[PDB]
Amino acid sequence: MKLIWSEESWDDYLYWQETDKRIVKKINELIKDTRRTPFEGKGKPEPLKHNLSGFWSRRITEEHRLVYAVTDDSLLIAACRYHY
């Protein structure tokens, strides 16, 4: 499964690398778990609605969530800072 970062989500991730290493580790942990079970597991995975229909969200922290989408061959990260 290829990992795809939107330009904004990669910037989010870089922000964390230069702000909080434990948040980076949690993001990594969530991505690895998602590779295992796409729609369940760590971070209490929940499907998003309305304008974000088609995406999922896992908890990094209360304020920050990993927003993503899973296709037959890829994990797309839409954002990893704030709720979206």
Q: C-beta of 8: minimal distance to Mg ion in Å?
A: 5
| Nearest one of 1, 11, 3 to 79, comparing CA atoms | 11
Site map 44..83 versus Mg ion, x via CB under 5 A? -----------------------------------x----
For residue 17, give the H/E element and its range.
helix 7-17
Q: Is 46 a catalytic residue?
A: yes
**Cβ at position 78, least distance to Mg ion in Å:** 9
Q: Does the annotation mark 50 as catalytic?
A: no
For residues 30 and 22, is the Cβ–Cβ distance under 8 A? no
Residue pair 38/46 in contact by the 8 Å Cβ criterion: no
Among candidate residues 8, 40, 63, 83, the one labeled active-site is 83
Residues that bind Mg ion (CB under 5 A): 79
